[PDB]
Amino acid sequence: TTTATRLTGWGRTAPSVANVLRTPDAEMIVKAVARVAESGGGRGAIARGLGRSYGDNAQNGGGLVIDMTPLNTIHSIDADTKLVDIDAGVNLDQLMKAALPFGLWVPVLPGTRQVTVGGAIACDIHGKNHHSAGSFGNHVRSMDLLTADGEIRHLTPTGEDAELFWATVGGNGLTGIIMRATIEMTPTSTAYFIADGDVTASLDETIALHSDGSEARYTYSSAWFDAISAPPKLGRAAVSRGRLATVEQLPAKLRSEPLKFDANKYTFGPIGELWYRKSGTYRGKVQNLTQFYHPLGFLQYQFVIPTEAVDEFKKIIGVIQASGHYSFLNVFKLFGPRNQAPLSFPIPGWNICVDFPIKDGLGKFVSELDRRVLEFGGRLYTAKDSRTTAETFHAMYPRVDEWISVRRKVDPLRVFASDMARRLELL
Ligand SMILES: Cc1cc2nc3c(=O)[nH]c(=O)nc-3n(C[C@H](O)[C@H](O)[C@H](O)COP(=O)(O)OP(=O)(O)OC[C@H]3O[C@@H](n4cnc5c(N)ncnc54)[C@H](O)[C@@H]3O)c2cc1C
Ligand SMILES: *N(O)c1cc(C(F)(F)F)cc2c(=O)nc(N3CCC4(CC3)OC[C@H](C)O4)sc12
Description:
Blueprint: E1 2-7, E2 16-22, H1 26-38, E3 45-48, E4 64-67, E5 74-78, E6 83-87, H2 92-99, E7 104-105, H3 117-122, H4 130-133, E8 140-146, E9 152-155, H5 162-168, E10 177-184, E11 186-187, E12 193-199, H6 203-211, E13 220-225, E14 237-244, H7 270-280, E15 282-287, H8 289-293, E16 298-306, H9 310-322, E17 331-335, E18 349-357, H10 362-375, E19 379-380, H11 390-396, H12 400-410, H13 419-423
Parallel strand pairs: 2-4, 3-4
Antiparallel strand pairs: 1-2, 5-6, 6-10, 7-11, 8-9, 8-10, 12-14, 12-15, 13-14, 13-17, 16-18, 16-19, 17-18
Bound molecules: flavin-adenine dinucleotide and ligand 0SK.
Flavin-adenine dinucleotide is lined by residues 10, 46-53, 57-58, 68, 88, 110-112, 115-116, 118-119, 122-123, 125-127, 172-173, 177-178, 383.
């Protein structure tokens, strides 16, 4: 039933060999776990979704990895309660297409639709609407968790078992296997966005745009920013903000199916600077999911710095541009309020995603970035991380001990284990 497979995260780095189970039969998954629990210690088990996490949180070298993608039954969708009851292996793309005809919108979407509900919960994923909607965990009304004792537990965010529910959110698989969840969806009357585009010339302008109160007018906000140019250019951005459109805001051609699923010589001169300002500046543009949300040998790096530490954030950015490591795909956003999950990554503050080409000295440079992020009160994201230390991680998440204590109640014999758990000492 299990196949010895060579696994890696999305970054295609740090491989380890695991016996991978792949079954639609929930019963065989249950017996598998009990089989891991019976054989004493061993290197335990971990669930895996679509493998989109860049790090080592869904591989388990020398142990068992359970592939959850064949558990992809959508059980029910209800437009009146706005609830969706789905297996953990359903992906958000499948969920998005199933839910649209009910006037229901997946409440948190990440940069790719190929992620499982299970993965979305376990990494407590965020998106472009974090400042208005929180993260994925905020919208989960219930989940069924297969715990180390072989029993399936029904968890809810309030009432008893709350502690365990909030340990599972952003718990990277380490409380057990989410089999099934109920999600509350966002009502919508269209599959479209209405978007305002703003272009800044400086980091200080980017920050001001995000501090002037304009952010409250928009449910979705993000920006591509310059991580390469010298200041004051550094941190100039193409900002894209907006909301889901209502049917009366759609052009006529689109009002009958409102919920339809869907370099040159001038380039571095002043004429292109002008083109770039023009084409990035607009009001009330209607856009489908792709145009607005997916507008598009590397090391993905993501951090958030708390809101108040704006000087510190600016400094980190400068260290990056003077580093001699050049990143082109840079996404910036201001996160809103955090949730109660002790290992949830997002906090209110300045979030950035960069992508460095693997080069001589990068490894030791990002270690130095880790220290700055730590010192400035931020954290890195397990979904993006393959290489930080246990000591850095623990200090970045001061509620880790509180989280560890919950995991020890639910998994006393350390039945659930991963490459990340051992590296980050969450085992
Ligand atoms: C191109 C790209 C863009 C991205 N953009 C964003 C973004 O904008 N925002 C964001 O937050 N993230 C983003 N991500 C990261 C991605 O959203 C998360 O890594 C997500 O957790 C991946 O889902 P997955 O199903 O592939 O899970 P995997 O990568 O297979 O697993 C991730 C973690 O979830 C756990 N897990 C999976 N299934 C279960 C289950 N059934 N029960 C318990 N635990 C489980 C795993 O054990 C592992 O710890 C991006 C990734 C890529 C490749
Ligand atoms: N950081 O990676 C990041 C943060 C956010 C936000 F929610 F915090 F704002 C959003 C976000 C995103 O929407 N997309 C990202 N992509 C990274 C990789 C990608 C697709 C989208 O970019 C080009 C390449 C083809 O794939 S990251 C991101």
